[PDB]
Amino acid sequence: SDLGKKLLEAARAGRDDEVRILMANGADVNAADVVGWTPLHLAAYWGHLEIVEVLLKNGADVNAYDTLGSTPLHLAAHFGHLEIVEVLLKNGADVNAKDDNGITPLHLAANRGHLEIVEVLLKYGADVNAQDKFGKTAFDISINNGNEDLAEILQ
Amino acid sequence: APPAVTISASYPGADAKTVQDTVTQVIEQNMNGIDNLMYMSSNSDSTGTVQITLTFESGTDADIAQVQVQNKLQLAMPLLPQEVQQQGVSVEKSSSSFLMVVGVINTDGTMTQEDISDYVAANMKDAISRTSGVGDVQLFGSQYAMRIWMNPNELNKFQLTPVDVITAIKAQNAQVAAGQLGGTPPVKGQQLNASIIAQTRLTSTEEFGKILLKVNQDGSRVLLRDVAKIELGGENYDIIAEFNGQPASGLGIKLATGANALDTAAAIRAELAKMEPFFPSGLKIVYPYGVFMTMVQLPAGATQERTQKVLNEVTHYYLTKEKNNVESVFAVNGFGFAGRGQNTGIAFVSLKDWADRPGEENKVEAITMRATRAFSQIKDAMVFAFGFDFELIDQAGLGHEKLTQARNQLLAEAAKHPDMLTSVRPNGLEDTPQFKIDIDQEKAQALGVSINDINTTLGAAWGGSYVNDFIDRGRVKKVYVMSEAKYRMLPDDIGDWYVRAADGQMVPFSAFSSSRWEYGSPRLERYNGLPSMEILGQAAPGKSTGEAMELMEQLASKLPTGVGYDWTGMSY
Amino acid sequence: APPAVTISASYPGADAKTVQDTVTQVIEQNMNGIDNLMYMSSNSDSTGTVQITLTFESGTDADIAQVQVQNKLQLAMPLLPQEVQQQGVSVEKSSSSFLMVVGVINTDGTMTQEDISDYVAANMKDAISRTSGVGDVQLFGSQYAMRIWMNPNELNKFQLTPVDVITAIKAQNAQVAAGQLGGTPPVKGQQLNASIIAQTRLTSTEEFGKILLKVNQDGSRVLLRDVAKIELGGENYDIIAEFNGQPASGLGIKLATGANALDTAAAIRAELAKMEPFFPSGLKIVYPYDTQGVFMTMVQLPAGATQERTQKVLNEVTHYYLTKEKNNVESVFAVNGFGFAGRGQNTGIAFVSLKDWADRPGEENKVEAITMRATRAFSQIKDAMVFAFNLTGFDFELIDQAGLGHEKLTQARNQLLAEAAKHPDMLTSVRPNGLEDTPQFKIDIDQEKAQALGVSINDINTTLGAAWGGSYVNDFIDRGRVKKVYVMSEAKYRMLPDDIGDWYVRAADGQMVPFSAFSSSRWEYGSPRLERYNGLPSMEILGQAAPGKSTGEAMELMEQLASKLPTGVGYDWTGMSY
Amino acid sequence: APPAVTISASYPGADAKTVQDTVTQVIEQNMNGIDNLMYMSSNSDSTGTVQITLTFESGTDADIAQVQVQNKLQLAMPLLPQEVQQQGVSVEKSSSSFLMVVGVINTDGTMTQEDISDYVAANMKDAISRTSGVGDVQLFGSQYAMRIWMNPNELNKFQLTPVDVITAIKAQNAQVAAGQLGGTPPVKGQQLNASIIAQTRLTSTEEFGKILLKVNQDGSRVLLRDVAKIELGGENYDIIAEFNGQPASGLGIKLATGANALDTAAAIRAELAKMEPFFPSGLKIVYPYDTQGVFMTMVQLPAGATQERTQKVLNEVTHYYLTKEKNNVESVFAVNGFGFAGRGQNTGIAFVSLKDWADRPGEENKVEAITMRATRAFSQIKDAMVFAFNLTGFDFELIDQAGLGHEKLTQARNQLLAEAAKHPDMLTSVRPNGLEDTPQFKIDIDQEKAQALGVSINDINTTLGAAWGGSYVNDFIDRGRVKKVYVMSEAKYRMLPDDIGDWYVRAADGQMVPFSAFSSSRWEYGSPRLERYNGLPSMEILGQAAPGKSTGEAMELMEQLASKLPTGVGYDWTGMSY
């Protein structure tokens, strides 16, 4: 869709007023680019909170995944966007979603030491015994990274 | 016009950050002790290319600068990767002008641009570089290169990897010194003295195809052609040159300082007139540049093919609706300015004589105004036909991601003052999706797979590898090993590539690697040795330029900590 | 003055002779085809450093001389070892003295001497380097490097050697070119084009710490932090500085030959203004040496003197200006590890800045009298040469003409000095300019025992070299800047001879073999700095004439006792004697 | 005199085409963008030598020309083979004639020709090379190297191969950077600081023989001297010199482009005076050539003529001057293996100095008359071009413009030479300037048999190349000077084609495999010197105009004859005809 492309580039750039007119003009809420990223994906990746909110109100698929299995909750947990992680979980995002590598958002937050996000994820039912394709849990990530603050959160 | 020096290097198969942190920075750190240097800027892009441009004070000898710059660079050559030294790091005065552009096509349509380019490299470029008063000559393409297009399915069938193919080629495409019989010092009275001749370079696709990779434990032999497709091709395919829709090559010829332009132009056309009897059937010489250009730039992530369809529509528009005026349309897919890549292109238009262009509608201005209005309705592509220079500096090691946020803060603040500033925009490229693959060391070591085997398998197949040289009809040319295109297109093709472990078992890439999508820069800029982002713009109507610059300086004075700025180019 | 060009190369962890027999001689044997060359001198020190100084005839274009020397060395580059090439060689035209010194201190005290030096190198040196007429920039300190401080007891516990550390760092701190998806040439119908990103160079000690060296047979994993301490630290720890007795770093600014003195200076001051707004809190630029008004104080200790003893002489010199001439001295910038001549663990220098000329009244308080009094006060410091000077004897070179050797040349030098001491009516202060031999630790690898146990010699020489001298592995990115990674033993385990046996090397059968099994050691005497003049081993001798006699008679005498020297010992005049 | 810049590389044991396609073509393809360049020629001969000559317009600043060429050569340096870079590629700007020749003899007969050659190269050549105005110094001989002369019988006896010998020499003749004790950063309070001295480069034949190759399973040691003869010997054995029949050596010195002949010749005599007092007993300097007084006698034999055959032609030339012209000739300095057109086994040169002008009264005793009789006496020497000259024609180049190949350029040259013979009215003595193709040994490695036996290709090519061509390994120290270490077979075992089968290579399973088991051979012809003009293969042809007719008429006939040659063959005029 021509509108869907203008929405993707507007969501990628954080233009909330252009995103609103595109929503009112009937643009596809779930238009995906070549890599499989929806407007919710890029707004979650680039930390545009209200674009994440406006999209979800207009029926955005909170659990859309790209060609490699990554959800908008994955990107938000990876890049320290704490407020976006909460609104995604509140709008029904799968806390235990796995990509093609069996990797969960808890792994991504633990890998980058996003402790505030780790607590919010486990508060919403994140499986802490979740293993990726190599059999590594979030606890193994804390031991390997040497992050002792996280290693006591997970216990 | 302030003199300038350009250092050009190439890292085949490298991403923008890879070239900056292994090449660009090391060269920038060695640019010390060079006299009369005003400022320095550099690019590092998608295609594994860096161009460091050092501009000097007006009145500086461009020859002395070129020598002073190259001497310091050459002393830093051991610090660059081996793949970069092999490709050659040129330092030429960017004394741009181009005396003339000579194109080479074939009317019979029996030659690819690769075929044509090889002819120009071998038969023309040298004899043109020797004609009276010519300087540097750049060829639109490259000479032939022995292309090995690997197939991972058959490679895995015989328990082979690209490492074996590279090992086999260096062993069986070698020119070995073997000594003499009866050479000095001899047994006194020796009568026989003959040179010993052992392996020589291979000369054909047939001889590369019979390279013995291995022999099974049964009698069967597996050769290089059993796992790959062999062909004479180009060294890189990042540019596709066309002339009126036909495959094309040619030379860009610059004049050597102190020579005369009308002289050398006639001396070149005379040197080309002598070569025509030696041309194969149908080879013609054109002069594709009373002229103008047309820019083509597609969204981030677009392919070379999609740029070609837009360039073909542009070539078609000029040859159809402007057939009364347009004489030639030289379309270059993959080259533009502010950035090269698969999603950019440029078109060079040559028009008939102005004596046969009566009417204002046939003047260049009315031609570009009409062309720009028709190109307005090209879906998902910008196509135009045809101030101040600001540099935002990373002054405290912030990083590319934060320097972009600081850039957007200044760009947004500048749009708040359309009364003084207009068309404030970045000159560089935006971040694009990239395929990050993470090698898991623990799984690789558990399986006995060498890290070097992995990074060579991945790199050589997906990016290409310059192994060694060979002799093509008596001339030294390159040998490149790469995957056939079918098996290096999409992420699922990664799982098809197998590496061999120490115990002998073939391990697929999927077993020891993970992959994600992320965003990164396809073109990192640097100014005076520090990460930079160039910003262009102009004053609003009725405002002096210095009025606009001070507002930019005011807006830049509130950017996050560690973010500075400088004026360059025409604003220096 | 005759224009001079200096070549600088370094060899990490190499002694004087290793450096001379591998770098100096190879460079010198290729210095042919150079026009207007008067003579050539070189130094090879136990710091692992060469400085070859080529002096050209008067009126020679220093640009042409540098270009010709630069191009000749470019051809000799493949003849040098890989370790010397990785360090980068420098060819510089410049004077011997400094144009100015830019000091950098930290009032807050949040940055130590080591951090201040790293900031100036990582954020100030390169831009000052490219400025108008600045020929030589000397950093009083060292840029940070990713320092891996190996522990031999932990390496032996996991059956690992520094070879495994260096191998794993090169594998897991790599910048991999991985190509593209949908790259050219592409299959038709391809809609996706994206760069592939494999491994990126590491950026933090945390990343280096989790470099996986090996996994054990029970599943547990050995990380790089399990066998070493991962910290940021300088490439070298040779030079440290102080401004008015407090931690400091700085840049020594030399004027490029032919450049204007002042307009350069203002350009450095201009670029410095561009940097100040982005300094961290507490950082401040001071100007301790600006070329009346300033003078220097040289401090030279004999070979075999440590930084501790040199620092003691520097404190005494700094304490003098700050206490007994505080009415005249504004500031004192003191550097240890760097003297006027060159580098050395036994050398130092102090840049003294005076108060404004108007505030010091009378003959008693001007640079001439202050330097006379200072030199008089420093003259009784034992086992040290301490002179004070602003901004006339002979310069003599004793040449090894027939391949005699260092020891035989030393005896001949002492013979000439003893005979010159018996003529106080003629020559006084006849002295060698170089250094005396010092105890060194000769270790012999028994090849037979190494082969019987199945221990590679390169594994042995890498384990010994990387641990006790340091090893430049590859480069990493520290806050967006390319810096070096260095592998070396923690201080603890490379200080005294008994520690040699603490180092283990793995044999072909996986057995850990201590260094004591295949080595043997003894003390002997070797040189810490080896001089050459015009390609031949030489020893510079300085001196002057007695009260009231012209150097011509002085010089003529020196020629005569050189004739009675042993067979194969020549001589030549240089410097201002030429 | 047009200014010329020459690039000279070396590739030991390499044939003409191997040198052409790994060094020559690589350097040539980057020789564009060079200002005021008229033309460029090159020779690649089976000496393992390439000589690219770049000629510039008159008035071109030779200094600048050199920088430009050198600067374009750097683009090819990383692409050249390692073995070529290790020899040291050189670029120089000099005339092609000799300014003078410095001869060295030993009146006491204490020193062999080889001994005199080594002393000149080690103690005399470098200081002359660095003298201002000296463009190029040609040594008439070769500096000593540590020659390892391998025995293949004894090597096979202990399951060893030249690869093992090479690996042992790099391991045991090593210069190790071993570090220090108490090095910075130290544990605070450290008092002891000493350099660690590990392996040093060997300095004698006795030390190289001590090199342990392996320990047999029973416990006995197999040393290098047990499989090789170890001696000091020249880097190559291709240049021998004689002075009045007695053994001698010397340096051929060409003047740098634009330098003063008198001043440079005087500076050379001043430098020679600095080294005479330290000569060994018996050594003496003689001056056989000084630029009437002098003339040269060029000797050039057919290709394939050994140094033996060339010495006899030189002996007849020296006999003529010493017997029949003894009233006018003072000295004859004869050089075998080096010639006017370069360097090769089949070439020679005699430098003749007449006695004083006063003691040669009469015109028949003048230079032209003496050279006139000399050439007339050398008219009837079989298979030799022997003429004498004091110091009309045309200079013709036949170019392969369509990649026809060397063999087809030969025929196109023969067809042109035959048509030029039928026109004596216009063209006189039209002949080529290069060499004719000679028999050569073509050996074929069966890749399948090698892989089936476990014998690696690198083990094969290193064994064959090092035994039959010699391999430069590393450096050693000979009387305080860095010199090369060469590994080669003893002459005895590299003389006949059956000696190939006596060379063994160890397979992966450990079994020795004779070279006959995986190879085959046949005789064929190939060029011992390949010429190139402006990048393309060429064959130089020279002749002169007939009596009375100008050169433009002869050139016009040559142009017409050359246009009748097969398609793809072109031409161009060079040198005196440009």
Ligand SMILES: C[C@H]1COc2c(N3CCN(C)CC3)c(F)cc3c(=O)c(C(=O)O)cn1c23
């Ligand atoms: C490197 C750039 C330089 O600019 C180019 C041209 N010019 C445009 C008009 N003037 C600005 C003069 C220069 C041009 F006409 C053609 C080509 C071209 O074919 C080409 C290639 O790689 O195929 C590459 N380039 C070209």
